[PDB]
Amino acid sequence: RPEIWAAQELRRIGDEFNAYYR
């Protein structure tokens, strides 16, 4: 489903950005 994939993608980017700023 496109909605599950979008959530997976936004979560990946979100956690990446969180980890970046710490």
Place this chain on the structure above:
Amino acid sequence: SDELYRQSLEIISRYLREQATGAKDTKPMGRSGATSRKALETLRRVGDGVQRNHETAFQGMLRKLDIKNEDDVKSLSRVMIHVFSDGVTNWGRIVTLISFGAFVAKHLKTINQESCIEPLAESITDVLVRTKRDWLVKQRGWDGFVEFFHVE
């Protein structure tokens, strides 16, 4: 009377509208405004950065969600709830959701230059404030955001 909601909606709406129109809003922000302005400044800096490197992914998602108009926000709300459904909450996720909201808003403006960003901003603010209320409160709300992304 819900100041956290009011403040959050103002911050997010202003960002989405600037991104969509390309122009900054020269009208004093409501009560607070000091934290709100710094939050908006932070959102410009980090939100633009998220959008960078992730243009391909964002475009991909916009396409797959097939957002047809300013009012078609139900699918985005579901996606946002789904993102938080692993039980993890952080500012990186939140800024990414808001940044994606700005991405969508820009695209809706190209299709229709008369598009309101408010339904989108209201949908995002609703998820954040309603579903993460106490998490935000504990942290003095937008001060948590400002400090998390604070750089020297």
